Design a protein around this ligand. Structure first.
Ligand SMILES: CCCCCCCCCCCCCCCCCC(=O)OC[C@H](CO[C@@H]1O[C@H](CO[C@H]2O[C@H](CO)[C@H](O)[C@H](O)[C@H]2O)[C@H](O)[C@H](O)[C@H]1O)OC(=O)CCCCCCCCCCCCCCCCC
Ligand code: CLA
Ligand code: CLA
Ligand code: CLA
Ligand code: CLA
Ligand SMILES: C=Cc1c(C)c2cc3nc(c4c5[nH]c(cc6nc(cc1[nH]2)C(C)=C6CC)c(C)c5C(=O)[C@@H]4C(=O)OC)[C@@H](CCC(=O)OC/C=C(\C)CCC[C@H](C)CCC[C@H](C)CCCC(C)C)[C@@H]3C
Ligand SMILES: CCCCCCCCCCCCCCCCCC(=O)OC[C@H](CO[C@@H]1O[C@H](CO)[C@H](O)[C@H](O)[C@H]1O)OC(=O)CCCCCCCCCCCCCCCCC
Ligand SMILES: CCCCCCCCCCCCCCCCCC(=O)OC[C@H](CO[C@@H]1O[C@H](CO)[C@H](O)[C@H](O)[C@H]1O)OC(=O)CCCCCCCCCCCCCCCCC
Ligand SMILES: CCCCCCCCCCCCCCCC(=O)OC[C@H](CO[C@@H]1O[C@H](CS(=O)(=O)O)[C@@H](O)[C@H](O)[C@H]1O)OC(=O)CCCCCCCCCCCCCCC
Ligand SMILES: CC1=CCCC(C)(C)[C@H]1/C=C/C(C)=C/C=C/C(C)=C/C=C/C=C(C)/C=C/C=C(C)/C=C/C1=C(C)CCCC1(C)C
Ligand SMILES: CC1=CCCC(C)(C)[C@H]1/C=C/C(C)=C/C=C/C(C)=C/C=C/C=C(C)/C=C/C=C(C)/C=C/C1=C(C)CCCC1(C)C
Lengths: 35, 75, 45, 36, 482, 29, 64, 30, 341, 65, 37, 34, 36, 37, 30
């Protein structure tokens, strides 16, 4: 139960961090009209 | 089968327990759970988690996050 | 109970993973031209 | 719980239309490949 | 190339291959008729014609064979239950062979037409293009129809040179194939007069003969030729589909509501006979008349035929089956063995109580016992529900008159309740469910299955009439506008 | 015009029914 | 336009009002008044039982 | 035994969806 | 020219409201059906047929007012005003529910007239008649529900009454007595209707979000003009978006619009087949295997069995007031209750 | 196109393709017969529907005997 | 006999094949429970 | 001639004289006039 | 007293190879007609 | 990826089709009695 | 019911023979 919880927490934290720092990486510039 | 009414009266919704595609369902969580957060690690055993309708909460939460992600991904 | 953290070990993932990724993001951040733009969004990337 | 007839109905009802569509598609692709 | 849903339109402008594919469809239909008759014969049990009739065994084409004369079999039995000494070639086994034989001939003809798609007949002398004079073909076909129609009525339904048709009494106890004379008065118009069939076919055949002569001799007006697109086969298809779904609706109505062409000994009772208590009133009527004669109750109920009592049973109602409850009605509630007799319920005071009969709408109906003035005296309570009028508490007793249990009195609550549940279904019958492993859920009679199938077919053919009429009236603008 | 007719066929009952319903509103019910 | 309507539209409305106010509506459409849903005797729901004697039945039921 | 038929039908439908997605006719400008 | 020619010319004139030959059937029948419905919901009662008050005159509102079906004593009678049931008496004709038959028959003929109107106007404008084939869906719905179902049942009484609360009652009555949700044809109908709504919403949003920048104004409704030889939205961009978002996308506009036509029509026709099946009580009410399992195992329960119990409750607790002609009298002991199971 | 004995026998029956009568021809007769047919259908429908009760026409199973 | 001028090729594109397979499998899934009853 | 047959014939006459004849008269009168 | 899957085996082992052969032959004829 | 040069067309003549149909039907006739047992 | 399967198989074989005889590929000199 602790090991499943720690695995789930690791996975969720990894994916949420990837989402958060990906939308922080100047996402508005990733459009076809950007020069 | 899941004791949905929380009265030790399990309701079957699985194909292996006697259901067909129409009658088959993922039974909602037990009434004793209420709206308490019920992950796998918050149950004493995996059998307890399955008996109280934990997979329903798992599917509902992950599905509702997935559809929010689908809205955002369409944008 | 603060993040559902009943065991201190749960705090090692909640911190190390966001930091490590941030470290990957810091290199992206150091490569950007970080002077101010008077615009709706920054096209420099 | 019904007899092999219910099984025969579901399995044949699934296959007879499936193999018809597959045969038609393969014939069309064969004509396309032969003419190109 | 052609899409999958237009492929057969290759034979739209080829009369020879159109005749070939129509011959193939007729061959398939005749082969289905023969094969279905053979299968039904292989499954039919003529042992008990009164309590296990053809409509209780899921027979579909056998009632239509028996309607117009085919009743004997090469196995030495008949549907009426008489033992036929010399069946004759025209027996259900013989009739089934005749349909299969016709199918083989039709297939060979269709192949010959398909190979010889190019015949001079089919070509227009003027232009040298394949063409079909429909107004004329219609006339030739209409004339042919009239002759066959008139013929069936004059020689067959009447019996002049034929077997006649199936005619029964008002309660389907005594029915057989016999000649029917034509009724030329207004009495030939009600659906429940077999003489009307003979008079109709004779008169309509004569009129169709005259109409075929006319449509052969006279060309269509230019306005009608341009309005109805009479040079196009698709308008013929649309009009034929319209008339066919019209006839399908009419036959569905006659089958469901009942007619002289839908005998109850061949297709089973209708639902409206149970709704109005058509057989129950006759049974009560007969019992009263016997009692008036001085005959005791037991003798009066012993004079009631088993067939009439079996007709007054809700399991024979066509509106009690299910869409996916497959098989014969015997597969549904078992095979009926014998009539147990009419039950009479009396409380401690001695009032006569009647179990309210189940309306066909209800899958489950409350079991309630009511006195002469309609007060509820006893009931079977909803399961595990506290009661005050339970059969155990009110002490109802059941005495049977007629049938196997004639003269027997039951005082025990379990037996009384069992008979009371059975009494809500109409006359109490004994069934065996081991021979066919019966599930106890009611099935539908062939009448109901025919009604369902042909009603859905009529609706889908109304859709087809709309589509093909739109196609023939808008041929110029199909595949895009300008 | 034909429009006249159709308009009056709609309106003459419409006003009659509106009067009837307004009267129904003041019934003691 | 406004001239003729100023004298018929009002009347049309009033006519409708009167139709109901007078009680003709009830007489014409057979709708029971609030005081005649259940006759002293017929304290039950009145229902037609036979189709071919429906007119007589209704005359008997609505006679009170 | 009917559970095996139900599972087979569901898996077949999912496979049909997979092949429709990843093996479709590729859209081209003509 | 000939009378027909001149009458055909007059009926085909470009007026504000097109009349046509089909108008001679459509306008009187539809007008009479609508007017009869208004008259029934305004004045005509249901006291002698259903034991119910259904008029504005009796105190009902828009939801509870209805033109109720004829009495169960009438059977499947045409209920002609001059017929043997009414014998020319307008009051008795209204009291026995003859106005429902009036509305139903004149409305069926009005639907036929409107379908013919679609055919005639399509033949005039020179376009393929894919209308009046789409309308075949609603025509089949009306025929199956308001005509074929009561004809298969005991009488016109069990047809839907022309009202909001009456329609809701019909829904619950059919669910209780037929388990129509379990019917696969009804399931196909629900799928068709929901998919048609999905297609409408998704196609509207896709077109609105893939428009070409054909104007300098922020509001883009002015950028379109009907006399355009160019498409107003990018099909390629929409196809790319839906192919990389959903995995599959339309590439042919014709096929897309035919599909948007086909889905609701197919759903309605499947539901019509299901209702025709219900007309003879030939219903997919129960699964025999599940019933047998529940009979020999009291601890076996699925949501289907709960639905069966719910349908039993609707039937017993509504039979008394929904079918007053049957004179159903059920004691409290025989009424099913969850407490007593 | 193959010539056969049966083809030559039936050829005149399939010879006048597109041959039409001038104008309206027998259209009023067709309309009158259709009107009579409609009246007949209404009569028989109302007889079955029991909305039309001719004497000695008992639309009922009991009329069988 | 001879060469028939009315012969036409028949084509079913991949999209149509997948539409047909999906329809057949979905109908089988829907009606399997009712056939098994 | 039952009262039912009399109602049928008069129904045919009324339909002719109240529906068919007036509407048809109008179409011929206005079609020919325009 | 015959078996039940027995019918399933007979019918499918007859149909699966028959429809395969028919599909292959139709594909070959389609190629021949397209090339010619 | 790209067009593969090893792709070859498959042919089944009618004689082969009839041989296959006859073989399958004859094997079915032979083994049906044993499968039904 | 197995008799139906036996008869179906026998007639299918006879029909295959019929089609092989009367719908064979016509031999020609190449
Ligand atoms: C799309 C295209 C169409 C577009 C829409 C068109 C709309 C206009 C037409 C709609 C109305 C048509 C007329 C319907 C009247 C009717 O049905 O009238 C019904 C009558 C029969 O009346 C009924 O007959 C039943 C049987 O009675 C018989 O049996 C009883 C047993 O007790 C008694 O013995 C009784 O005396 C005896 O007559 C019961 O008595 C019923 O109470 C009684 O109402 O049939 C008849 O008039 C004639 C029967 C011949 C068939 C004609 C209609 C066919 C349509 C399907 C019919 C239902 C079939 C099942 C559908 C699912
Ligand atoms: C020599 C010819 C012949 C004969 C004697 C029979 C005899 C029989 N057939 Mg078979 N049959 C035949 C040819 C024949 N068939 C062919 C060629 C086919 C293929 C299409 C079939 C397909 C077939 C099937 C599928 C079935 C039968 C059945 C039957 C039996 C009942 C017949 C019945 O009720 O019909 C009733 C027929 C009708 C009610 C149709 C009436 C004609 C309509 C009303 C015409 C309407 C349009 C018309 C042109 C308008 C006329 C206008 C007017 C003015 C004149 C009977 C033993 C049934 C049976 O018992 O199974 C074996 C059955 O299910 N037959
Ligand atoms: C007008 C058509 C018609 C009618 C009314 C009947 C009527 C009858 N038949 Mg016959 N039959 C017919 C045509 C017809 N048959 C044909 C064409 C065949 C050849 C295949 C047969 C073969 C046949 C046999 C072998 C038997 C019957 C039997 C019966 C009886 C019971 C049938 C039953 O319970 O249905 C049950 C029906 C269903 C469970 C489903 C019906 C179809 C529904 C509406 C859905 C179908 C569409 C749906 C989309 C399919 C999904 C496919 C999916 C897998 C892809 C009844 C008398 C039985 C009997 O008692 O006779 C002795 C019997 O043993 N019939
Ligand atoms: C006598 C009846 C009749 C006849 C001769 C035709 C003939 C034709 N129709 Mg019409 N049609 C009919 C009835 C009829 N139809 C009805 C009742 C409907 C309503 C559903 C339609 C709806 C319809 C449409 C919507 C279209 C046609 C089209 C066509 C043409 C090509 C059909 C084709 O290639 O299908 C090929 C069919 C297949 C490859 C497989 C279909 C299998 C179906 C879906 C289920 C299987 C049915 C089963 C085997 C037997 C049914 C039993 C029977 C009692 C019904 C052809 C001219 C098409 C056309 O060319 O017009 C432009 C077209 O678009 N028809
Ligand atoms: C497009 C016009 C149209 C159509 C199709 C119908 C059709 C119908 N009406 Mg409606 N109706 C109409 C116009 C129309 N009406 C108008 C304008 C009025 C106002 C006067 C009415 C007032 C009305 C009432 C009050 C009633 C009907 C009823 C009916 C039905 C029974 C018809 C019947 O048997 O009458 C029989 C008469 C005819 C069919 C006339 C035909 C005349 C023939 C063709 C001419 C030849 C006569 C012969 C030589 C002698 C039927 C569905 C009845 C019904 O079903 O309600 C439940 C009913 O009670 N209608
Ligand atoms: C409940 C839903 C519903 C309603 C109310 C409705 C209504 C309408 N749709 C029409 C059209 C259409 N419907 C279409 C597709 C669909 N329509 C659908 C569902 C509906 N359609 C669905 C699901 C589809 C998908 C297949 C198409 C493709 C069309 C058209 O071409 C047409 C149109 O132009 O619309 C834009 C009009 C038909 C006019 C007519 O017949 O002439 C006049 C009206 C007559 C004859 C009806 C009167 C008689 C009726 C049947 C009985 C009386 C009813 C009372 C007056 C009211 C009772 C109210 C209670 C029931 C609450 C009308 C506005
Ligand atoms: C941006 C998100 C905006 C959300 C708006 C709505 C917020 C509603 C209120 C949320 C309160 C959150 C409080 C802190 C979190 C918390 O305590 O978790 C509360 C729970 C606690 O979890 C439970 O806690 C219990 C306490 O007794 C026990 O310890 C249990 O063992 C433990 O499982 O954790 C979660 O439910 C996590 C849910 C999954 C989150 C997925 C985020 C996906 C990405 C979102 C966007 C990121 C950018
Ligand atoms: C799709 C591709 C296949 C299409 C269909 C092909 C059909 C033809 C082949 C069918 C073979 C099996 C027929 C069995 C019929 C039957 O009655 O099954 C009936 C049995 C099932 O038996 C049942 O079992 C149940 C529990 O599972 C219950 O106990 C029942 O009481 C019992 O009857 O099915 C089988 O046993 C199939 C086993 C097959 C194993 C392979 C064969 C043995 C190994 C030999 C391998 C080949 C060696 C070289 C040969 C040269
Ligand atoms: C990326 C894709 C990942 C897919 C798989 C994700 C995990 C699926 C769920 C697994 C699960 O529920 O296991 C339940 C078990 C606990 O069961 C419990 O285990 C307990 C014993 S013990 O804790 O395991 O020693 C005991 O209470 C009992 O056996 C049982 O309730 O959880 C685990 O042990 C998983 C640990 C490893 C997780 C790897 C992922
Ligand atoms: C060859 C020839 C030579 C000369 C003489 C000869 C030797 C005698 C002869 C040989 C002859 C003999 C051997 C030939 C006799 C042959 C066979 C038996 C003909 C049987 C055909 C079965 C019909 C077409 C069924 C279709 C089933 C229906 C449509 C499916 C319906 C279903 C669809 C999906 C809809 C849903 C459900 C339903 C409705 C059930
Ligand atoms: C406020 C409000 C809120 C929401 C928005 C909103 C909906 C717009 C608004 C509503 C406003 C309202 C309340 C609008 C309401 C408008 C109303 C009530 C219009 C009534 C029209 C009545 C007609 C057409 C009856 C004609 C009678 C006929 C044909 C008789 C037929 C006859 C019968 C009986 C049968 C026999 C034959 C004859 C004799 C021919």
């Amino acid at each position: 139960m602790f090991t499943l919880k720690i695995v789930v927490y690791t996975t969720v934290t990894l994916f949420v961090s990837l989402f958060t720092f990906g939308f922080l990486s100047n996402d508005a510039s990733r459009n076809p009209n950007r020069k | 089968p899941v004791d949905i009414d929380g009265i030790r009266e399990p309701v079957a919704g699985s194909l292996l327990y006697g259901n067909n595609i129409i009658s088959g369902a993922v039974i909602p969580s037990s009434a004793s759970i209420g709206i308490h957060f019920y992950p796998i690690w918050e149950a004493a055993s995996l059998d307890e988690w399955l008996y109280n309708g934990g997979p329903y909460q798992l599917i509902v939460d992950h599905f509702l996050l997935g559809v929010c992600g689908w809205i955002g991904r369409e944008w | 109970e603060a993040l559902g953290v009943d065991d201190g070990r749960l705090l090692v993932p909640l911190v190390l993973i966001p930091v490590f990724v941030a470290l990957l993001y810091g290199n992206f951040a150091s490569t950007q031209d970080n002077e101010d733009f008077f615009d709706t969004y920054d096209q420099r990337r | 719980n019904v007899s092999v007839a219910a099984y025969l109905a579901v399995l044949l009802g699934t296959f007879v239309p499936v193999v018809f569509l597959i045969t038609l598609f393969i014939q069309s692709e064969a004509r396309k490949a032969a003419e190109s | 190339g052609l899409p999958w849903y237009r492929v057969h339109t290759v034979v739209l402008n080829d009369p020879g291959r159109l005749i070939a594919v129509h011959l193939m469809h007729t061959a398939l239909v005749a082969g289905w008729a023969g094969s279905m008759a053979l299968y039904e014969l292989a499954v039919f049990d003529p042992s008990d014609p009164v309590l296990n009739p053809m409509w209780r065994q899921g027979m579909f084409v056998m009632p239509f064979m028996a309607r117009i004369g085919v009743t004997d079999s090469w196995g030495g039995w008949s549907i009426t239950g008489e033992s036929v000494a010399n069946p004759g070639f025209w027996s259900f086994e013989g009739v089934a062979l005749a349909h299969i034989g016709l199918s083989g001939l039709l297939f060979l003809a269709a192949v010959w037409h398909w190979v010889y798609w190019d015949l001079e007949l089919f070509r227009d002398p003027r232009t040298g293009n394949p063409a079909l004079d429909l107004p004329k073909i219609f006339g030739i076909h209409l004339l042919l129809s009239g002759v066959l129609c008139f013929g069936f009525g004059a020689f067959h339904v009447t019996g002049a040179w034929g077997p006649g048709i199936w005619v029964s009494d008002a309660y389907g106890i005594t029915g057989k194939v016999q000649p029917v004379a034509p009724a030329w008065g207004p009495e030939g118009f009600n659906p429940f007069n077999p003489s009307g069939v003979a008079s109709h076919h004779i008169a309509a055949g004569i009129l169709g003969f005259a109409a075929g002569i006319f449509h052969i001799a006279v060309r269509p007006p230019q306005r009608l030729y341009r309005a109805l697109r009479m040079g196009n086969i698709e308008t013929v298809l649309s009009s034929s589909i319209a008339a066919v779904f019209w006839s399908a609706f009419i036959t569905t109505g006659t089958m469901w509501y009942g007619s002289a062409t839908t005998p109850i000994e061949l297709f089973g009772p209708t639902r409206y006979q149970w709704d109005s208590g058509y057989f129950q009133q006759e049974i009560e009527r007969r019992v009263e008349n016997s009692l008036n004669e001085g005959l005791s109750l037991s003798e009066a109920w012993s004079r009631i035929p088993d067939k009439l009592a079996f007709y007054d049973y809700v399991g024979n109602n066509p509106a009690k089956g299910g869409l996916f409850r497959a098989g014969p009605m015997n597969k549904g509630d078992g095979i009926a063995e014998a009539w147990l007799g009419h039950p009479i319920f009396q409380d401690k005071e001695g009032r006569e109580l009647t179990v309210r009969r189940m309306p066909a709408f209800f899958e489950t109906f409350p079991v309630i016992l009511v006195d002469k003035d309609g007060i509820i005296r006893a009931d079977i309570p909803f399961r595990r529900a506290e009661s005050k009028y339970s059969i155990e508490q009110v002490g109802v007793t059941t005495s049977f008159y007629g049938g196997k249990l004639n003269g027997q009195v039951f005082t025990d609550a379990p037996t009384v309740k069992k008979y009371a549940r059975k009494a809500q279904l109409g006359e109490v019958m004994e069934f065996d469910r081991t021979t066919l492993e019966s599930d106890g859920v009611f099935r539908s009679s062939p009448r109901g299955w025919y009604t369902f199938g042909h009603a859905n077919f009529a609706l889908l053919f109304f859709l087809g009439h709309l589509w093909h009429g739109s196609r023939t009236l808008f041929r110029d603008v199909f595949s895009g506008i300008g | 015009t034909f429009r006249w007719l159709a308009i009056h066929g709609l309106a003459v009952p419409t006003v009659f029914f509106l009067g009837a319903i307004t009267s129904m509103q003041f019934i003691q019910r | 336009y406004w001239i003729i309507h100023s004298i018929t539209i009002p009347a049309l409305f009033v006519a409708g009002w009167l139709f109901v106010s007078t009680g003709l509506a009830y007489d014409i459409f057979g709708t029971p008044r609030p005081n005649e849903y259940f006759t002293q005797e017929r304290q039950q729901v009145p229902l037609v039982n036979d189709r071919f004697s429906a007119k007589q039945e209704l005359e008997d039921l609505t006679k009170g | 035994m009917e559970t095996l038929v139900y599972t087979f039908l569901l898996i077949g439908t999912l496979g049909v969806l997979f092949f429709a997605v990843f093996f479709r006719d590729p859209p081209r400008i003509a | 020219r000939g009378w027909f020619d001149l009458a055909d010319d007059w009926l085909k004139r470009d007026r504000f409201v097109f009349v046509g030959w089909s108008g001679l059937l459509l306008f009187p029948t539809s007008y009479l059906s609508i007017g009869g419905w208004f008259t029934g919901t305004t004045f005509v009662t249901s006291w002698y047929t259903h034991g119910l008050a259904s008029s504005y005159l009796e105190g009902c509102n828009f939801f509870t007012a209805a033109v109720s079906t004829p009495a169960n004593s009438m059977g499947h009678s045409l209920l002609l005003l001059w017929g043997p049931e009414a014998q020319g008496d307008f009051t008795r004709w209204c009291q026995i529910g003859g106005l429902w038959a009036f509305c139903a028959l004149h409305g069926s003929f009005g639907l036929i007239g409107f379908c013919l109107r679609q055919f005639e106007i399509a033949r005039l404008v020179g376009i393929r008649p894919y209308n009046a084939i789409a309308f075949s869906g609603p025509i089949a719905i009306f025929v199956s529900v308001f005509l074929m179902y009561p004809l298969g049942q005991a009488s016109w009484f069990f047809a839907p009454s022309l009202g909001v609360a009456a329609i809701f009652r019909f829904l619950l009555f059919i669910q209780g007595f037929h388990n129509f949700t379990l019917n696969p044809f009804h399931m196909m109908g629900v799928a068709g209707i929901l998919g048609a709504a999905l297609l409408c919403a998704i196609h509207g949003a896709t077109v609105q979000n893939t428009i070409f920048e054909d104007g300098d104004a922020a509001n883009t409704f002015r950028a379109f003009t009907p006399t355009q030889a160019e498409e107003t939205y990018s099909m390629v961009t929409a196809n790319r978006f839906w192919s990389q978002i959903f995995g599959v996308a339309f590439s042919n506009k014709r096929w897309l619009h035919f599909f948007m036509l086909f889905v609701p029509l197919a759903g309605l026709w499947t539901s019509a087949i299901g209702i025709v099946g219900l007309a003879l009580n030939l219903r997919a009410y129960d699964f025999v295997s599940q019933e047998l399992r529940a009979a020999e195992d009291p601890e076996f329960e699925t949501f289907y069995t709960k639905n069966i119990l719910l349908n039993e409750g609707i039937r017993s607790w509504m039979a008394a007031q929904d079918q007053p002609h049957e004179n159903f009298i059920f004691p409290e002991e025989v009424l099913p209750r969850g407490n007593a199971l | 196109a193959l010539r056969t004995r049966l083809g030559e026998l039936l050829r005149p029956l399939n010879s006048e393709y597109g041959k039409v009568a001038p104008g309206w021809g027998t259209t009023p007769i067709m309309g009158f017969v259709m009107l009579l047919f409609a009246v007949f259908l209404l009569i028989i429908l109302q007889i079955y529907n029991s909305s039309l009760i001719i004497e000695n026409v008992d639309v009922d199973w009991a009329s069988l005997g | 006999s001879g060469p028939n001028p009315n012969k036409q090729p028949v084509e079913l594109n991949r999209t149509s094949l997948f539409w047909g397979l999906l329809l057949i499998f979905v109908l089988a899934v829907l009606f399997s429970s009712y056939f098994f009853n | 001639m039952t009262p039912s047959f009399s109602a049928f014939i008069n129904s045919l006459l009324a339909g002719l004289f109240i529906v068919i004849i007036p509407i048809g008269t109008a179409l011929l009168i206005v079609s020919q006039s325009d």
